[PDB]
Paper text:
The T-cell receptor (TCR) recognizes peptides bound to major histocompatibility molecules (MHC) and allows T-cells to interrogate the cellular proteome for internal anomalies from the cell surface. This TCR, α24β17, bound to A2-ELA with an affinity 30,000 times stronger than the natural parent MEL5 TCR, resulting in picomolar levels of binding. Remarkably, although the enhanced affinity was mediated primarily through new TCR-MHC contacts, α24β17 remained acutely sensitive to modifications at every position along the peptide backbone, mimicking the specificity of the wild type TCR.
We next explored the possibility that Ala substitutions could impact TCR binding by altering the structure of the unligated A2-ELA molecules. We reasoned that, if α24β17 TCR binding required a conformational shift in the peptide, then more energy would be required to reach the same final bound state, thus explaining the lower binding affinity. Collectively, the structures demonstrated that the α24β17 used an almost identical binding strategy to engage the Ala mutants compared with the native A2-ELA and that the Ala mutations did not alter the peptide conformation of the unligated pMHCs.
Residue numbers in the entry:
A (entry chain B): 0 to 99
B (entry chain C): 1 to 10
C (entry chain A): 1 to 276
The structure:
Amino acid sequence: MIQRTPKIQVYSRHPAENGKSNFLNCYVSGFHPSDIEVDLLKNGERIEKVEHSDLSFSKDWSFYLLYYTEFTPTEKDEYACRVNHVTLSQPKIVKWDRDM
Amino acid sequence: ELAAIGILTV
Amino acid sequence: GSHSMRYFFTSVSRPGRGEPRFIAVGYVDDTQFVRFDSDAASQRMEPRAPWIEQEGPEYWDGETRKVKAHSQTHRVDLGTLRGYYNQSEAGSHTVQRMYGCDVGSDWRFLRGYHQYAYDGKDYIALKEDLRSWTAADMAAQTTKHKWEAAHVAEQLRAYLEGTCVEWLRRYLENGKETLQRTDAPKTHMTHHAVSDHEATLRCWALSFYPAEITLTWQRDGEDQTQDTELVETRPAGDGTFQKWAAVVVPSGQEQRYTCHVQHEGLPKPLTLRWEP
């Protein structure tokens, strides 16, 4: 039984401009098995209207998924991605950095 | 299009 | 350039929770065009690209029937593999299958593939000659003998070398506006002061297609990997990709570093340098 922990990247579709509509993405990859929980958060509260891509995998058989939501960034609001998987003894929260 | 041949159980 | 059509299938057992989850997706190059998901309301193969929607009801009925047949064979496989490895009923297991073909610039067959994995590991794979099999262990050798007896390699060879390449050519023509395009990366560099002793430079590549790209850093014209960070190429969500690479440099030495970007859309590799 192979277990691989996921890599997580949180970023915007377009360069963030405060007050301008955009998409917030959480990309999870390199994981196995496929069951994974991914939630996008705004100021610590889960965002409901989130969509995701169809599960696929890489040359090494590890899985990847993109989760995304429409949003408008501001200077004060904090966004993050929360991920849980069997390899994590505790859910991982990755904060959005507009330059990463 | 998907394959219609060569897909058999292991 | 070269092009490819690939289909990916995943089946996951659900101990004490019924039928296995089944997901199938199809790609031409780095662009998804179809999907089937057993949890979906439709229970049909569905379009995920504008250019495949034009295909008639004959197409969708046929793909739906074939994808449901792939789902049923995986359903049986999960049961067979549990037996082959004498695994208990309490655990969840995964089967993955991938197949497809590559064509060259002339749109002629280059190579074909068909690989299978169980629990994230190679189980059996068709060799590049499309005539023989590589089996990972003794359980997979049982499957290899069944598949040799049923001439599975010869069937796949006919599909990969015929049907696969003919349909890929067709999709490449119907989705020409989408599929035969190359988007060169839009690039820039950012700078962040971390301390009065170090700073970070981040080189960005955005809105590019296809996904293959190379980002490298040099210090005084010498390749540098130490103190560098490179993130996996990631999808923007709009059909293009993104990537960045960063380096931590001594404060005031920023201009000694250069970021180099290679991509199919770039006649010449690009060179960037921090310019305030």
